[PDB]
Every structure is written in structure tokens, then in C-alpha cells.
Amino acid sequence: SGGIEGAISVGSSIVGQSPYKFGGGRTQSDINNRIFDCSSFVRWAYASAGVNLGPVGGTTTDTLVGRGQAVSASEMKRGDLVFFDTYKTNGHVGIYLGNGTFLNDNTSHGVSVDSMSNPYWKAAFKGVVRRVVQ
């Protein structure tokens, strides 16, 4: 229930049950209701598994790109944070699951699993990856 597998387990447990809360996931009420934005979702899943990615109120995509250790796309592993260019550079984040998929929270269907080779996400990905558990 800890580390990479604990974060992925906890995060995956609300797939389909967690609509995106725009800019949210940091109040006690949002956390109670398990609704998040892309970065507060990642922070919550890892914090639930005992991994500190930053304070609740201050953690965003901007701060998560500074956490952990930079690794190359070619060496990316299950549990790494993958970043994507949406409306801005590194505007979206998810947790790589291995085998070409990633767990994330986005507005279309909330917490979900998407494919790295989905044409949209493939184009959005510029190789920015952060390893947060060694």
C-alpha cells in the first residue's frame, strides 16, 4: 500500500468515479470528495502511499516538474511522472504505468487511464519525465 504500487493502486481506485475539479483538489472538502485537478490528483495518490511530492496547497504542474530526478523518455519506468504540453509547456501530468499507458485526471472523463501512443498525447509529450521513487 506504499510507494509506486500503492500510489497507482490508490489512484486507480477512483477511475470513472472522480470528475475533474478545475484548479482544485487542495481543499479538505475536495480531498474528502476525491476530486482533483491533474497535479493535485498525482500529489494525492503518491501522498496516500507515503511519498511526499510537496505541500497540499502549493503543489501544481509547475512545482511537480521540479520534484524527483529527471530521466529520459527512453528509460521511463512505471511510477514516473510524465508531463505533456496542452495549453502551455508541461501543462498536464500523469503517472506512467509501464507498457505504454498512464494514469491521469483530465477534464473529459476525470480520473482515467490513457495511452502514450494516442496521437494527441503522443504529440503533446516532449520527453519531460520525473522519477519520484528510486
Binding site: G24, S39, S40, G57, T86
Partner: protein, 155 residues
């Protein structure tokens, strides 16, 4: 007049989307040469940034949103997204979002007409090809205009 067509409903929805995004972002991009105060503060265990000058006060934000959102929607939107006034300046918590819903290519199906309200269900295709999203939007006649009754109905 007493009606709102599919075509008109989508145009209003797109305006609501732009106003919601710009207000959460702190700036209307079409106001040029606005100044944006830098610096952050903590309040209610959240990290805040300041609105840019074009939305720099609550009054400026209310006037920006009045054409497209009802009075109740504006008040509840400030509360729901934890806007605050600090040192006379409007401020919004930090956070993230995305624009995967391709609202401009959506279709609108009428669901309800009750009193002075009309509800449409939009089927919104996505930028990443995930299943098209269902989104209900309720429009209320206020001050002779059809206005969206939820600040966050169109994201």
C-alpha cells in the same frame, strides 16, 4: 425571444467557456497592456496569485461576467473556486486545467423548458478522441438576456 435555439445556445456556451477560463487564469487576453502583480500569499491553507489589472478587483470581475452568467452563478462561482480579496486586490488559488473538450464542434439537444429556464445537453467531441462528453447547461433569462446559471458549466 422567449426561445433559445441550438445555434444560440452553443454561442452562449462558448462565451461562458471563455469567461470562466479567463477569470480562473486571471486575465482576459484581449485586454492589452494590463499589468499583473507578481507574488503569492497563503490563505485558508491554499496558495494564491493575484488577478491581472483588467480583473484586479471583485467589481471588475463581476462586470466582466455579468453579460453571460446569472447573478447567482457569479456569486456561487466566486465561492466554489475560493476567490478572495487581499490588500484590495482580487486573487485566485493556483492550480491546473486542460481544454480537451472541443466545445466549438459540439451539438446541442434540448432537454427541458421550465419557467424562464432552458436546459440543453451538449455532446462535446474531445481533442484526444476519448468518448464524446455529455454536458448539461441551463440558461436563465436575466435582464432580457439568456445567461448560464453555473460559472463552471462549460469547461
Amino acid at each position: 425571444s422567449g426561445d433559445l435555439s441550438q445555434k444560440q445556445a452553443l454561442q452562449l456556451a462558448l462565451s461562458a467557456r471563455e469567461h470562466f477560463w479567463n477569470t480562473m487564469s486571471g486575465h482576459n487576453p484581449k485586454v492589452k497592456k494590463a499589468v499583473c502583480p507578481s507574488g503569492t500569499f497563503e490563505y485558508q491553507n491554499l496558495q494564491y496569485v493575484y488577478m491581472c489589472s483588467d480583473l484586479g478587483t471583485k467589481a471588475k470581475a463581476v462586470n466582466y461576467l455579468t453579460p453571460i452568467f446569472t447573478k447567482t452563478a457569479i456569486e456561487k462561482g466566486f465561492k466554489d473556486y475560493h476567490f478572495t480579496v487581499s490588500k484590495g486586490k482580487l486573487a485566485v488559488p493556483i492550480g491546473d486545467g486542460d481544454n480537451l473538450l472541443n466545445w466549438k464542434k459540439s451539438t446541442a439537444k434540448l432537454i427541458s423548458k421550465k419557467g424562464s429556464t432552458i436546459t440543453y445537453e451538449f455532446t462535446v467531441p474531445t481533442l484526444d478522441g476519448s468518448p464524446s462528453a455529455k454536458r448539461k447547461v441551463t440558461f436563465v433569462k436575466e435582464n432580457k438576456k439568456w445567461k448560464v446559471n453555473q460559472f463552471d458549466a462549460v469547461i
